[PDB]
Amino acid sequence: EAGEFFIRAGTATVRPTENVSNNTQLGLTFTYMATDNIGVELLAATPFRHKVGTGPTGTIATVHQLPPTLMAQWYFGDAQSKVRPYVGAGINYTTFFNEDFNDTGKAAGLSDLSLKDSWGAAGQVGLDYLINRDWLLNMSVWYMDIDTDVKFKAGGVDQKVSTRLDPWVFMFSAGYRF
Secondary structure: OOOOEEEEEEEEEEEOOOOEOOEEEEEEEEEEEOOOOEEEEEEEEOOEEEEEEEOOOEEEEEEEEEOOEEEEEEEOOOOOOOEEEEEEEEEEEEEEEEEEEOHHHHOOOEEEEEEOOEEEEEEEEEEEEEOOOOEEEEEEEEEEOOEEEEEEEEOOEEEEEEEEOOOEEEEEEEEEEO
C-alpha cells in the first residue's frame, strides 16, 4: 500500500563473482512505498568479512566491507495482493576497512592493503509474501556492479590494480509494517 514504511530483517549473503570467499550477515532494508507500486528502499547490513586468496598462495588477506544500496523499485500486483514480486534498480556504495594480510601473506613480502571505496549500479529481483496487515516473508536477489582498486606493497614496492567484483546478494528476510 502507498505511504507505507516497512522494515525487513534476515540473512544477507554476499558471493563475489568478478579467489574470494562468501559471508552471510544481518541485512536490514528500509523500504518506503511512494505509490501503490513504486518503492524506495535502502539496503544496509552488518560489516561483512571476506577471506582473499589466489592460486598457490591461498588465504593471504582478509577484508571487511559495508555495502549500503539505494534502489528504485516496482512492485507487481495491486494494493490488495498478498504475493507481490518486485524489481529494483539503483546505485551501490561499498566501503572497505580492516584490510589485513595474514601470517601466510606477510611472509610473501606483502604489506599495507587498502581497497578504495566503490560506487556502482545494482539490480534487484525480490518477492513479498504478505502474511497479514503487518507481517510478511521476503526473498530478494541483488546484482551489484562493484569497481574498487587494490593497493598493496609488494616487497616495499607500491602495487595498484583495479578489479571488477560484481557480487550476488541473497536476502531471506521477514518484514514488518511500521
